[model samples]
Target chain A: RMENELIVSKNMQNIIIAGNGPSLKNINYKRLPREYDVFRCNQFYFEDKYYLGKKIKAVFFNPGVFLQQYHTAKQLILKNEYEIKNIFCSTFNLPFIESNDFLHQFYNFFPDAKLGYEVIENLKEFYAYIKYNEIYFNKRITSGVYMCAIAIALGYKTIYLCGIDFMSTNIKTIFPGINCHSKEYDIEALKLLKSIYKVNIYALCDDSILANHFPLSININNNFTLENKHNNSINDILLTDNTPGVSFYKNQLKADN
Target chain B: RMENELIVSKNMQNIIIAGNGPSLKNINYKRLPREYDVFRCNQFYFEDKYYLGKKIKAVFFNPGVFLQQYHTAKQLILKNEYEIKNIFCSTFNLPFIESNDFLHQFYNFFPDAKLGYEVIENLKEFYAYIKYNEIYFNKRITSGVYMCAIAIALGYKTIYLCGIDFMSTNIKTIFPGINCHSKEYDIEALKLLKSIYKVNIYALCDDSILANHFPLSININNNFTLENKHNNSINDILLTDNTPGVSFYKNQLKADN
Candidate 1:
């Protein structure tokens, strides 16, 4: 019932749900609008400029995965570079939260212990259990899917996806050794989200598998100015990335003269 | 007054006026809609798939340039690749048209034969002359500016610009030795067009100088399928361009795995 209430709440709009798909490395994060709330998942700490202005406002993760392999997630939460405001955890790992009461805010907390029968008593006040829909096929969902469903249920006007490539390509997930789930499952989950949410969805990477499901995202580079002198200086800084085919033509003009 | 009638005519909408700017080579021309009328200008034969479906419907050129280049314009006219419907010419060269009455249909025949006084006599039936505005400052306008002004006067709903990166960058114009006119002047012409026209304008190249004057363009690559087999084949075909960012996560995934 609490989860139902959470779904009915209309507090946010235009939320961005970012994933660990390798395409994340290619986006100009500074260009991401500062107005929308941002959601990140798993071990996403890469310390790159890609996340500089795209502050991670919320995080979703499996508690078991967080504690394993040198405590990567614990270290990330400790650094708190993103100043994460909310945490969504798998219900099975709900009992493992003896240490992080300091995390403070938690909402729509879906716990999956004992075939979705158990709820984390400790996080009950803040926890909002996931009201499983028939579309999920009674199977466990990926954290990415969970975050998406949460955003949609929260009444976001638009959902923009980044780094959620579900193709079988060699691209690794944010956690180096992890691989994405089956593409078939990915599409099914996306379709379920689309059918349930009455909101616009877009993908940041033009090459993303998600683009097949949502409108491919367009980056509006409005930072350029009309003055030629200022433009030349800004162009140099902008085109310094090593990516090929990204050269500024203004430099060519200088070379031409 | 035929020019006045032409200026008021609402014959076309959603036109793509391509310029000789070097950035044109980098665009995905196959992605352009086949429905819109495509207008190209002087010495425009590059013979590439970049302009594949964009059959040049019309041409704009200075009559002097057409005559002096060993009849390059005449040869293009003979090649018959494009069923060029009409030709726009300057008035000074209106008398030069004596040899090629075969050009058939002429429209907006603005002539400046001797300083300021001229006639739209020869091609009156099909011609439409440009009514000079105060913005020109009495200087000769670039062919690109002239072409844009003509499109605006023709009442295009939106003008999509490509290959108009006026920067003297290494991206050579189709006519290798030729250089574009003043950037200041180009912006001025565009500003004039903007003030008078109630239409949207966009540029394809993010690095285009036109981005300062018009909204930057976006490539809509939406043909991908949900099936892996179909996706792989299409992805390979689509990402074949040398533009590094065009690749799907396949390359990165491979590296990560």
Candidate 2:
């Protein structure tokens, strides 16, 4: 029943998975794909009003966690200024878990928070995932990890990662002190996602390991048009099938090949 | 015996402690006090030539740890381009530790590297120091922490902190990937330094917690003249004791009193 509901909501051919990594700060948001669905994970907010475009399609977070530690998220999302339609979570309400969490204790907390549950199973195939879950459950599965699965599960053919740099340290997130993802788990999960996923994955971060594995998704006003990606106008792209997984750079490489 | 060596070598009145935080990129290095003695922590290098002034008096590092990780230090110190007189370290060489370290494993690594040990005891009094050390040694006690203690111990009346913002993530260091200090440890250490030290400590970084605690140190031309900090000629100034620990701002407060 949940899977059927997910399919009905899938209208986007191109989707962007926005992570709270430091690399997001460098991007010129005006150049991002305005037509695509954008999925922001866990306490994502913008410094500028139109920084991440006019709309963020959905926001994924864990309710029974220290979600309130992210002050900007509380200020922006709770205020309903940005308007998040889909609020993704693991549980609707963990009453016992909510007893100790910081988000519940804060004054003027959002009482009527809409909640939904979604899971991504592609991550479970990795050996590290099982090992990590043995030690912990609630906080271990980062929002980025879940969002990666959610993007695939939602049936987005082309997924571009914005600020989803797998680097654990020396970067700021939407949250003041907390990093977007755990280092050990994220590094392993991202590596697995690169290999397992059939869909095209592009990264906006030039410094990320993802940039090395996947092609870079940047807006350069050049000779190549966006329509060529769909019409199969550009042949000799490096792919065994016409899966649209091969990005524009295949032509850049084709001249050399 | 160690204290005698420190006193004999002292000639500088004002000192700059430059940490490799991302905030360094924002500073106009030409505006820095060129006449003051400047001390930079491990792997510290400037992007532009003569950007951080023509000279850096000393370079501080941990020899047992990441001494060789710095390429510019190798080029500058090894070739003697910057005229660095003091090469401060905790150990001359940790031969046993180095055997397990990366520099040893990498071929063409320099074997006969010159080094000197200097202890900064001013940090011992901080509660965070003991707490941080208890969890981990070596890497946790960052070079910036030691440099802060060293400046005070060497009898610097005014210490200016450049690029020492203790932001954990998002800020890049002088080195491409490394962060100069941990945020939690740095916040505690800097706060303790602000309260405990007699000398006035100012931060060049506006974003730092240090900016809140100490007044910013910047070059400003005035009629009082830089040399005549004493002789009671500057009555409009703030120091009651003329001990130099009380900065010019104190005199502004004296008029109000």
Candidate 3:
């Protein structure tokens, strides 16, 4: 455990991550070191299909419970082509778990030695436990605060945040043909995390998050300079399925991934 | 009634009254005939102590109620020096009038034939009624409405307005030693009156009323050829008692002497 904690702490820097299609197409994943952790949230159906062959560290998803109705994201997560790790199944699927044992079995594929115990089966108990935990009281929190908390507890020192903006000016009804992920988890998780970390908040993408939140430390794309983001919203934020680097950039924010 | 109205109509003009004190002191009041019906609201109180003694037409006042700390303009109606001819009380006094007998007694002191009416009372009610009546709402419509309404109702064809600035910025608190007798009533009344009559609105009193209400009309008093009172502010509105003329300018807006 001590050696693992040391390794986690030493290697916490230079992580990789993937978001919806935007993350895969814009962000260059192959340039990221293989030793870095990678995790992509949601966006498996359409976006992941293209990036399925990439050596992503892990994938976390809250299947079929977003305010947005992303048809491809929903359909693709259900497919059996790629390996999924750390799946955060919604309680709505509690009844269907017998048939969806594939989800549990996927997480089980990792040895118990490498599995961090933070991924709880019940979100309610996890939320309450995190709320009561006195040590994480001042610790920067997020909607992903519980997951982050477990990661921190297991001794990951430096944490990298991604896709944390909660505000959206447009409605999901605009994209009828293509599917996308709901920003609910990212938005709420980032808010809770903001209360704890304060300025340490890193909006994974979108300069609008920095302009609106004022407090968050936002990182622009590898190709995007600081002036480019502050002056204009990163062009990468508009990218969808065809973009190459989106998957690689979004995955870097995860722990085991 | 129609014949009498027509007779008075020919004799009268919408009297552009120069309010009491120095503002009116220079003006040739004799030029305005009795039927012309020129009456400065309350300037008669302090600036022109003999206002009631003189053949003035009408006076407006707020009943000594509601906000008690401030002097009620109605008190001027009771001054011993002047024999107040016609008294016009504000709408706020409407609710408190317990008897027509008291009204008759008031009429007896001022005389039944000499009395007239100006209904829009208090700044708030003045604006509200203007909004309700669909009057062209401007900040300056205060007494212009009432003046127009009363002049039209009285069958006066040629109405001349004086000292009807809704915002009487020229006039301020009276000098400490002397009694200006100008109260909140006139200040508030003009605001209401302006809203009531939206058209042909001009600042009254060459100075105080114009300065306080319609500033644009003030005459340039400093050293300009535009000696016309319409463009310049009274030298010192409430200083009527101190400087004789400017002090009279402040009290001119008051309803009664």
Could you say which candidate leads in lDDT?
2
* Tens-digit per-residue lDDT, A169-235, candidate 3: 2223233334112344444554554454332333343343422542333333223221111222221
Judge the docking of candidate 3 as incorrect, acceptable, medium or high.
Answer: incorrect
Over the stretch B1-257, how does candidate 3's per-residue lDDT look in tens digits? 00111223454444444343344443323323333454445433444223223444555443322111012222332232233344454332232222332333232122122223333232344435544433332222233344444544444444434433321232323313332123344445444444544433344344444445443333433221212222222222222122222223223323232
- Superposed model 2: Cα runs more than 4 Å off: A1-257, B1-11, B28-34, B64-74, B77-80, B90-118, B122-128, B131-133, B136-141, B166-181, B207-210, B222-257
Task: Grade the docking of candidate 2.
Answer: incorrect
Candidate 3 off by > 4 Å: A1-7, A11-17, A21-36, A48-53, A62-126, A129-154, A157-188, A194-199, A208-211, A214-257, B1-257
lDDT tens digits, residues B1-257, model 2? 01124442345567877777676554534345545777776646433323354366666766432323333454564544454645565331222222313333222242333233224433334422332232123324456666766667567767777676651121232123643236676656656666776666766766666577567766453121122122322111111334442334234333422
- A-chain TM-score, model 1: 0.54
Error of 1 at B155 (Å): 2.2
Residue A216 of model 3, lDDT score = 31
Across A49-126, the per-residue lDDT of candidate 1 in tens digits comes to 434243455566554332221123322434443345444554433322222321211110111111111223332322
Ranking by lDDT: 2, 1, 3
Q: State which docking tier applies to candidate 1.
A: incorrect
What's each prediction's TM-score?
A: 0.31, 0.33, 0.25
For candidate 2, write residues A9-86 as lDDT tens digits. Answer: 445567777777777665534345545777776545433323365356666656433233222333354454454444
